[PDB]
Amino acid sequence: YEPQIITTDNTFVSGNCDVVIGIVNNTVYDPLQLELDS
Amino acid sequence: NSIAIPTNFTISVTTEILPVSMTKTSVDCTMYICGDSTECSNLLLQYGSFCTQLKRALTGIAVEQDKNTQEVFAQVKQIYKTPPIKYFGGFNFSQILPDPSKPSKRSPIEDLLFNKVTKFNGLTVLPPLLTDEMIAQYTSALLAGTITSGWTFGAGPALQIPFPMQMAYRFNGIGVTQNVLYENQKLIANQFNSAIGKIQDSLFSTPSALGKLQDVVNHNAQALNTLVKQLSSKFGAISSVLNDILSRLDPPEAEVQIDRLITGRLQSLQTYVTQQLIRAAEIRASANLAATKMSECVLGQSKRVDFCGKGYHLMSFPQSAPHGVVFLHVTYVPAQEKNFTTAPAICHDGKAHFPREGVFVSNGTHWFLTQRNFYEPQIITTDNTFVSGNCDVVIGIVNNTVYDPLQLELDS
Amino acid sequence: VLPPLLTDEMIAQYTSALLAGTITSGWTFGAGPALQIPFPMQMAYRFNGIGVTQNVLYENQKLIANQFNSAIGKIQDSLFSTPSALGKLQDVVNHNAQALNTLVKQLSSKFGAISSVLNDILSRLDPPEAEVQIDRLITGRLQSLQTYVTQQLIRAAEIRASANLAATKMSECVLGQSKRVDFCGKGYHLMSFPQSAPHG
Amino acid sequence: NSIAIPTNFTISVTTEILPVSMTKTSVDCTMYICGDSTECSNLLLQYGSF
Amino acid sequence: LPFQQFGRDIVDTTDAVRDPQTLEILDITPCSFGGVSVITPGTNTSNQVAVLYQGVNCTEVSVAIHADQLTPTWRVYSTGSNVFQTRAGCLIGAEYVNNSYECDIPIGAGICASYQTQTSQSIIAYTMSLGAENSVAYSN
Ligand SMILES: *[C@@H]1O[C@H](CO)[C@@H](O[C@@H]2O[C@H](CO)[C@@H](O[C@@H]3O[C@H](CO)[C@@H](O)[C@H](O)[C@@H]3O)[C@H](O)[C@H]2NC(C)=O)[C@H](O)[C@H]1NC(C)=O
Ligand SMILES: *[C@@H]1O[C@H](CO)[C@@H](O[C@@H]2O[C@H](CO)[C@@H](O[C@@H]3O[C@H](CO)[C@@H](O)[C@H](O)[C@@H]3O)[C@H](O)[C@H]2NC(C)=O)[C@H](O)[C@H]1NC(C)=O
Ligand SMILES: *[C@@H]1O[C@H](CO)[C@@H](O[C@@H]2O[C@H](CO)[C@@H](O[C@@H]3O[C@H](CO)[C@@H](O)[C@H](O)[C@@H]3O)[C@H](O)[C@H]2NC(C)=O)[C@H](O)[C@H]1NC(C)=O
Ligand SMILES: *[C@@H]1O[C@H](CO)[C@@H](O[C@@H]2O[C@H](CO)[C@@H](O[C@@H]3O[C@H](CO)[C@@H](O)[C@H](O)[C@@H]3O)[C@H](O)[C@H]2NC(C)=O)[C@H](O)[C@H]1NC(C)=O
Ligand SMILES: *[C@@H]1O[C@H](CO)[C@@H](O[C@@H]2O[C@H](CO)[C@@H](O)[C@H](O)[C@H]2NC(C)=O)[C@H](O)[C@H]1NC(C)=O
Ligand SMILES: *[C@@H]1O[C@H](CO)[C@@H](O[C@@H]2O[C@H](CO)[C@@H](O)[C@H](O)[C@H]2NC(C)=O)[C@H](O)[C@H]1NC(C)=O
Ligand SMILES: *[C@@H]1O[C@H](CO)[C@@H](O[C@@H]2O[C@H](CO)[C@@H](O)[C@H](O)[C@H]2NC(C)=O)[C@H](O)[C@H]1NC(C)=O
Ligand SMILES: *[C@@H]1O[C@H](CO)[C@@H](O[C@@H]2O[C@H](CO)[C@@H](O)[C@H](O)[C@H]2NC(C)=O)[C@H](O)[C@H]1NC(C)=O
Ligand SMILES: *[C@@H]1O[C@H](CO)[C@@H](O)[C@H](O)[C@H]1NC(C)=O
């Protein structure tokens, strides 16, 4: 156990949210976007 | 430049049948050779330790058979139980899990296996230390362990994991990403359930499927019937029955004929014991293989090709059988491949780009990066590839655009 | 002596099929359908297997191919030059030849009989005595056969263990890339190729 | 704090030799023990299934 | 058939005879026999032993003790509580308990014996334990 922030670097994207049976709603934190909007 | 990549897959479940133990026998050397004959016993005493050596060899075999059973099945520190709600992500394990309505508490497959596989002069048969119910309990514990805790079962405490996530791990372990399982979870569960039903019908229909265990039973039955049959032989004596020799002949002539029968009968016992020692060694080798298969196929995901069945190994389930173990090996088999054009690297601005995890493919007009064991084209980017060298040293490098996300942002 | 069911040509055909699959497909053929792949890419993935990146193979592809070809030539010269390299297979042949020679020589033994030849016993002794001398020879020859069969069963078990190891090695190192240390040669395993040999 | 790292490599090919099968034999028990002898064969019959 | 006088099994042992005077057919059952095993805690702990008569019913052993028929000349005193029927045979020198434990000295068919302190030490027999129970908290 070593919890990490869920980000766009630690995950990959494939498909939409309507296929995975157990998918949950949770913010994924993008590093580059946070700097660019700021 | 041509590579074939599967676009579909099959979930296949195969059956591996291994002997683990054999019938444990014991012989009363005096009753067999000189049954109810004082004179014969007194002549038999002149052969010394022959009986002791035969008894010791068979005792060692008898102990070995229980050791073999323990080594194959007694691999769990705790007896694990399944939940009362049998919903393992949509996978149906009802044919492998114990059926509580049967007094023997065997699974339907174990019950089938048990139904298909089918005191003499001084010979006995010893029971195993672990009864069929105890073996069934170990098998049930092994199934509950793998089904509810996956691979964590065999290397520390059991840690519960949702079954679809256990499968996602198992897919990742063979080079197939987690999304393949999750997007196709219903298809995978249906193929698994179908494969299990096919196995049940395959074992029911084919009478030779369990021949490996039936041969062990038949060979030991033949050895005992042969050993008893030899008592009717004469080996040159006037009669095979000792009372006729004592009745018809003067004591010293009876002693000569008795020594002749003693020699023939003790030679028959030495032949029997020698064959039992050779068979015991063969069974031990089989039991050692079964124990290895149990540890590497059931308590983990083996990466050994064709060790745990054909295809890429995902998981396995033990089932008990008379004198042995049957493994159901669940594997991933590539299917419905397509042939794509490939290249070892992409040339962009003079840099040579290589895949980090995959193979570059072309559909004839556009280049994509795909995972090797399942066609799933991705856009070739600077996150998926790495750069080493220029567009000169790599043989067969193809010119294509590699996308960089940050550079697109710089435009924003 | 009974012939094998598979001839040397049939074994060569199986070896050729395994080799063609390994060269043109890699382990995708061992696991199911044979999927063609360019050989340098098969090697690139084998390099990732040992833990070396793909660019090492591609930048050094000519060096790697030259070292491979040289190593194969060295193997041919090693087997040609050193007659003992295949002793393991010759020993099996020699022991079985010895067993049969021993088995036939025992027929000449008397085992305490007047004569080792049954026709001499029958020609020289009245049946009630001939039966005793014949029974003595029967015991001697029967014990010789039991000894031969027992030795053959022990040797058969040794050969079975060897065959099981050979099958395991072919399944894990020819139809795949093994991670078992020193299972298939010294060094980090890349690939292997079978060749047929008499009785092995 | 000292580590050695290879800067080059050698592709090596080695051999492994394994027996797979051995000569198959068959023995005519009666001819071996009692070849072309009726009296011996008849005595041999008294030894049973050997 | 009126012609036939006695019968044999598939291994040529005798299993039936025709009475020479009454012509009644009688079956011949071999007289009970088997091996004898002695369960010993070790002579550095206790001199009590248990005896297993392999492959027999405790009823035939009790009968063979009542009549002077059983071949071994030694006897193990029967207390009732120390006579336990196993599938392996009749154990007449250990008390059976319902408390399972790890197997110590195996007897067979799931039954093991061990030397333990009484609820003062004696040889007991029990069904061997396979392991602790652990229900896994599986959920979606
Ligand atoms: C990958 O392969 C699987 C397995 O072949 C494909 O699933 C299969 O799809 C066919 C056609 O949709 C199904 O056939 C239909 O079955 C129903 C059953 O009631 C029947 O009524 C229809 O008339 C038709 O025969 C087949 O059952 C189905 N197999 C499974 C196990 O679900 C899948 O579509 C393939 N995917 C790709 C992308 O190639
Ligand atoms: C898990 O799989 C088992 C089968 O492997 C499912 O049980 C099976 O369910 C079907 C439909 O309910 C049964 O078919 C029916 O059987 C009765 C028997 O009298 C027959 O009269 C009907 O006409 C029909 O054929 C099937 O027999 C039954 N098999 C067994 C062994 O129970 C089970 O429902 C599945 N569970 C889940 C949660 O999917
Ligand atoms: C190789 O794969 C690419 C990517 O799938 C193929 O190009 C893509 O083809 C689809 C149609 O099958 C295009 O989708 C269509 O785009 C138009 C845009 O106006 C839209 O109106 C349609 O409703 C539909 O969405 C897709 O845009 C196109 N992608 C690109 C980058 O052109 C390509 O044809 C494949 N080549 C071969 C030989 O298979
Ligand atoms: C890594 O080691 C390999 C050898 O294991 C090095 O390749 C070898 O380099 C030497 C000198 O550059 C070559 O020797 C030359 O061969 C030519 C052949 O025509 C000859 O004319 C020259 O006079 C000289 O003898 C050797 O052949 C070559 N071996 C191979 C298989 O190509 C490689 O350079 C080493 N790399 C590093 C970074 O150390
Ligand atoms: C995750 O968020 C999406 C919205 O981004 C949710 O989808 C909406 O759910 C409400 C529920 O009443 C519907 O009325 C909307 O029509 C849905 N919109 C879309 C676009 O689907 C989704 O339900 C959320 N999931 C969870 C588990 O909270
Ligand atoms: C990939 O693109 C580069 C340039 O972007 C090509 O380089 C040319 O190679 C030819 C080879 O004869 C030279 O004559 C040109 O002068 C090169 N141009 C430049 C700008 O360097 C390269 O050939 C392309 N590769 C393929 C396979 O099309
Ligand atoms: C000869 O054998 C017959 C039977 O085969 C004997 O007949 C039986 O003898 C018993 C003697 O107790 C009677 O109870 C039976 O009723 C007789 N049988 C019938 C049909 O009556 C006969 O006794 C024998 N005789 C001798 C001299 O041994
Ligand atoms: C996991 O989810 C499944 C549904 O996908 C649950 O099973 C359902 O349970 C309800 C009762 O609560 C039944 O009415 C449904 O028919 C069930 N569906 C199926 C497909 O069996 C299951 O109980 C959940 N597991 C846990 C531990 O909560
Ligand atoms: C022992 O004999 C009794 C006789 O009534 C019988 O009921 C019982 O089942 C027998 N037990 C065994 C194990 O044979």
Numbering used by the authors:
A (entry chain B): 1108 to 1145
B (entry chain C): 710 to 827, 854 to 1147
C (entry chain A): 860 to 1059
D (entry chain A): 710 to 759
E (entry chain B): 558 to 676, 687 to 707
Could you pull the original sentences from the published paper?
The JN.1-sublineage KP.3.1.1 recently emerged as the globally prevalent SARS-CoV-2 variant, demonstrating increased infectivity and antibody escape. The spike proteins exhibited three conformational states: “one RBD up,” “all RBD down,” and “flexible” (i.e., one or two RBDs disordered in the density maps due to flexibility).
JN.1.11 is JN.1 plus V1104L, and JN.1.11.1 is JN.1.11 plus F456L. Additionally, we also determined apo spike protein structures of engineered JN.1-derived mutants carrying S31Δ, F456L, and Q493E. Our results demonstrated that S31Δ indeed induces a fully glycan-occupied N30 glycosylation site in all of the variants carrying the S31 deletion, including JN.1.11 + S31Δ, JN.1.11.1 + S31Δ, JN.1.11 + Q493E + S31Δ, and KP.3.1.1. The N30 site (NxT motif) was found to be predominantly occupied with high-mannose glycans. Similarly, JN.1.11 + S31Δ, JN.1.11.1 + S31Δ, and JN.1.11 + Q493E + S31Δ also shared similar NTD structures with KP.3.1.1. In addition, other spike mutants with Q493E retain BD55-1205 binding, while F456L resulted in a binding affinity decrease where the only mutation of JN.1.11.1 is F456L compared to JN.1.11.
